[PDB]
Design a protein around this ligand. Structure first.
Ligand SMILES: Nc1ncnc2c1ncn2[C@@H]1O[C@H](COP(=O)(O)OP(=O)(O)O)[C@@H](O)[C@H]1O
Lengths: 123, 64, 182, 275, 134, 68, 91, 123
């Protein structure tokens, strides 16, 4: 997107954008070896990148109002301020303790925490 | 998706680390094996530790 | 360059028809197909796969098929052919190699990697195959040849673990060593 | 799709699967030796000191029964990498038990991966470790048991975390609990049912302490070492398996790209021949 | 509460010779003070055997074992349930003694308070092994 | 003496057996000789502070003592 | 870069600046692949103060690209390798 | 080279030539296993192969007059006799003791040994 630049949009939005791209980009550079062998033998720093990358990848998905019949769950409308704040806290390591499943098809970061926290309570 | 590069880098990386240590030992072994001027004397009389750089300047100072 | 193989082939048939045995070797046979392809393209003939004519296969068939073993009635002569082919990337999946292999009985595949390793002649026994087989060998070679083929066959399967000689258990490193002798 | 690149990547996976398959053979070979050594050395003097101490009724009457507030954790992991998930399991459990409450564990690691993996999470907590073990034997296990004894004085309890080799393909984490030297001596002096006069009690108490400590250490190493070769072999099998699946998938794309290549080049020749 | 006639266990970190045996009739070893003899009904007691000889009588001949061994050091415990266990560092037969091969580079020692006992013990075992061969 | 070796000197029982066999390791069969071997490494654990190799096993290397 | 048009242009020009998409998203902007980039003029154009520092810069970056793999290997790092690894990261 | 024939050129020249080719060919095959396991896990026999192979490979590098502007080292001329003798000695292990760093961009083996000793007195 040509609109992505530090001067046009807020500098914070630019940093959070590169943070996610750099995170997924590094994880993408390891998918090859991850396929041959698991992540257990992977280095600690690299495991953290892989682990957090899964959380962000699952959080990107969200239900649509038009696709409500397909999935069967209500759509979600994410505001820009919530979007930036959601990924900002996730990159910092807010919801890393919760399972990656709670971020699947969620609108806001706070919604995933409620689901992730409930998953920890039932068990 | 480039696994050939991954193996290539792993090869160069580990080999360098392994032989880099061997280079140190090789130098120490060959050095120990090989082990077994007016300004130089005057300074030794005063039992002052002199570096090679200082000796050069004094010699240059005289010739210059 | 296109007529030379047929010209030499006719000279061999003379010995074959008269009962004598002859050996004809077509050096750079692949270049012949290129020469014929050139004449085809310059004549504006409809080009096929890899710009070769539709009868590129027939070109080699009629040539090699004239080398045969005549019966005792005509004299018992024979004509052995040894056409050579140059693979660009060692891939026999190309157009011309598949043709010459389908026409010929067997193919002696030479590897460049084996030559670097010092295996001279760099003959790849894995791909090399002979249709006649022991029928051509003499009674003395048939026996020792059979056992030899099996030993190398097992060695190539275990060759994947050559670097791990002492780590592996006994009764397997010995087979690896034996293959190295062969 | 640039067949030259695909064919190169296919060659790489082929070599990985080859070397991956070979490492499995060595993994099985060494596992046999370790199991042979384990089966011969297992249950060696294990629970002996524990049994007789239980037989000492007077000891149980005067037994000092208290909860140790400070303990020492000595996890056991393999030093060579690419050995399986056994190391990840041990470092994971100790991480949980340690991250929960800090400053109550010394965490003297054993094994390169065990110490290296726990270095960054627990800095300033683990100060020394043992690695690069040439071979497993009782004299060495005693040297390790002796070192742990020197470091166990500061803590009220000692426990070892290691993999239990219950089956060739099943390795469950198991942890033993051993009391320190100070607690052992004060408990051993109460021994009166089993007479000790050939060597006097002052000497016997310290000697049998080594046997009590080395026995557990020696047994733990064997169980973990056997689990290493076991988990390593299983890892290479899964790795070689995955390597083959991916290699076969690219082969299909290679053939698909081969057909498209011939199609593209052939049309170019026809286009030029048309005019 | 109580155990049968007896059970003996001779184990070594690298091999187990007798997990549990009842045919043996008597055991004799040398401690620091003097030689002891452990047999059926021997009361509870602990012992620590230096690298001396261990002789055990068998009612029925046991395969691969001679009954006369020279151990490098071990612990002995006679449990309350009439059971004795012998755990030694290593074991071998007298026939494999290979005498006259001692003092082959390890004669050098350090003049300290610990090196003194080290040499003391080493000399004591040498004189012992030499006698054990006879 | 095994008793005084520990009282007047911090010599553990295991180290004593090692010193005991030390003079007779050659007399014993090779089977036992391979058993009497200790070789490992001890690191004081910062990124690269210390790397100690424990191979002597008779002096104050594996089983320290007061006399040493 | 094995296509027809790119191959020809590379052979016509003196040097070429290869841009990588991976380096761009990993924060390396300008995403320049020094391993492949090259110039015929070389140091003949640089100033005196640049040639001296430029020469050593290339060697340092060359080693860092090699040690990149061992970073994943880990489990140990020599005193000098840690310096070369860090030093390259600064560049 | 069509001249690479034991009958055309001296047998000694032909022998040293193939000796280097086989050495490099063996080292190339070890690269695969070294990538995963490393040089340490190799046997003593393979270690020497990789050691001499790298020294020979680096020793092949030769600075010429036309490369001075790029590298900054004056060109050098190597005779055929010194060339064959230099590699022949390396195949026998004459330079296996010195580091592999000196066998780089050198003209003759003697030049490499002199540079090796100079580096010693320098440190
Ligand atoms: N001996 C050399 N050593 C190090 N770098 C070199 C050397 N020779 C050339 N380079 C580099 O190679 C490049 C020139 O490549 P060139 O010879 O022109 O290839 P081409 O024949 O295709 O034109 C220059 O940038 C130059 O810096």
């Amino acid at each position: 997107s040509r609109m992505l630049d530090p001067i046009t949009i807020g500098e914070e939005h630019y940093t959070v954008a590169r943070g996610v791209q750099k995170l997924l980009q590094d994880y993408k550079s390891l998918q090859d070896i991850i396929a041959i062998l698991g992540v257990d033998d992977l280095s600690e720093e690299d495991k953290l990148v892989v682990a957090r990358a899964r959380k962000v990848q699952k959080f990107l998905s969200q239900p649509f109002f038009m696709s409500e019949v397909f999935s069967g769950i209500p759509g979600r409308f994410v505001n820009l301020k919530q979007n930036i704040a959601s990924f900002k806290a996730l990159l910092e390591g807010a919801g890393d303790e919760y399972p990656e499943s709670c971020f699947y098809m969620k609108g806001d970061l706070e919604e995933s925490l409620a689901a992730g926290r409930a998953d920890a309570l039932k068990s | 998706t480039r696994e050939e590069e991954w193996l290539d880098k792993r090869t160069k990386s580990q080999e360098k680390v392994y032989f880099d240590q061997e280079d140190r030992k090789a130098m120490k072994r060959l050095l120990e094996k090989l082990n077994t001027l007016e300004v130089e004397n005057i300074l030794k009389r005063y039992h002052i530790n002199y570096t090679q750089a200082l000796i050069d300047e004094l010699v240059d100072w005289k010739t210059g | 360059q296109f007529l030379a193989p047929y010209s030499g082939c006719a000279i061999g048939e003379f010995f074959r028809d008269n009962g004598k045995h002859a050996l004809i070797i077509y050096d750079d046979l692949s270049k012949q197909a290129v020469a014929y392809r050139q004449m085809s393209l310059l004549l504006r003939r409809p080009p096929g796969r890899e710009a070769y004519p539709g009868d590129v296969f027939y070109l080699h068939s009629r040539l090699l098929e004239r080398a045969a073993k005549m019966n005792d009635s005509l004299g018992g002569g024979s004509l052995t052919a040894l056409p050579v082919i140059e693979t660009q990337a060692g891939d026999v999946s190309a157009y011309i190699p598949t043709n010459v292999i389908s026409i010929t009985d067997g193919q002696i595949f030479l590897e460049t990697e084996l030559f670097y390793k010092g295996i001279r002649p760099a003959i790849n026994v894995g791909l090399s195959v002979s249709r006649v087989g022991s029928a051509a060998q003499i009674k003395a070679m048939k026996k020792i040849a059979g056992n030899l083929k099996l030993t190398l066959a097992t060695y190539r399967e275990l060759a994947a673990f050559s670097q791990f000689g002492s780590d592996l258990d006994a009764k397997t490193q010995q087979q690896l060593n034996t293959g190295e002798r062969l | 799709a640039n067949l030259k690149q695909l064919k190169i990547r296919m060659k790489a996976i082929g070599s990985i699967k080859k070397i991956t398959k070979a490492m499995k053979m060595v993994a099985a070979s060494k596992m046999k030796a370790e199991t042979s050594r384990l089966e011969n050395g297992r249950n060696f003097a294990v629970g002996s000191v524990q049994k007789m101490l239980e037989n000492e009724s007077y000891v149980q009457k005067k037994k000092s029964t208290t909860a140790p507030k400070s303990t020492l954790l000595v996890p056991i992991t393999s030093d060579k990498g690419l050995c399986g998930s056994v190391n990840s399991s041990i470092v994971r459990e100790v991480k949980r038990l340690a991250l929960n409450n800090r400053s109550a564990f010394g965490l003297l690691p054993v094994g390169e991966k065990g110490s290296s993996g726990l270095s960054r999470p627990f800095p300033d907590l683990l100060k020394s470790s043992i690695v690069n073990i040439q071979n497993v034997n009782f004299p060495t296990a005693a040297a390790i048991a002796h070192q742990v004894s020197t470091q166990g004085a500061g803590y009220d309890q000692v426990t070892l975390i290691y993999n239990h080799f219950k089956n060739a393909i099943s390795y469950v984490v198991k942890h033993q609990e051993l009391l320190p030297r100070a607690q052992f001596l004060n408990l051993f002096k109460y021994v009166t049912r089993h007479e000790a006069v050939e060597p006097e009690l002052e000497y016997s108490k310290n000697y049998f302490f080594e046997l009590y400590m080395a026995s557990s250490v020696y047994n733990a190493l064997l169980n973990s070492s056997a689990s290493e070769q076991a988990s390593r072999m299983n890892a290479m099998e899964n790795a070689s398996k995955n390597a083959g699946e991916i290699l076969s998938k690219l082969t299909l794309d290679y053939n698909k790209a081969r057909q498209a290549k011939i199609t593209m080049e052939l049309i170019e020749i026809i286009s030029g021949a048309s005019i | 509460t109580k155990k049968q006639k007896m059970e003996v266990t001779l184990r070594t970190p690298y091999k187990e010779y007798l997990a549990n045996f009842d045919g043996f009739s008597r055991i004799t070893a040398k401690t620091n003070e003097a030689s002891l003899v452990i047999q059926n009904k021997t009361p509870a007691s602990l012992y620590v055997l230096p690298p001396g000889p261990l002789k055990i009588r068998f009612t029925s001949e046991v395969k691969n074992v001679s009954g006369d061994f020279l151990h490098t050091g071990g612990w002995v415990i006679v449990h309350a349930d009439n059971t004795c266990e012998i755990n030694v560092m290593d074991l071998f037969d007298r026939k494999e003694v290979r005498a006259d091969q001692f003092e082959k580079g390890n004669i050098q020692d350090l003049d300290t308070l610990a090196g003194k006992y080290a040499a003391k013990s080493r000399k004591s075992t040498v004189r012992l092994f030499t006698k054990a061969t006879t | 003496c095994i008793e005084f070796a520990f009282k007047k000197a911090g010599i553990p029982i295991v180290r004593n057996f090692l010193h005991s066999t030390e003079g007779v390791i050659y007399g014993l069969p090779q089977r036992v000789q391979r058993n009497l071997a200790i070789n490992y490494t001890v690191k004081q654990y910062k990124e690269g502070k210390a790397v100690s190799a424990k191979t002597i096993k008779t002096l104050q290397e594996a089983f320290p003592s007061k006399g040493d």
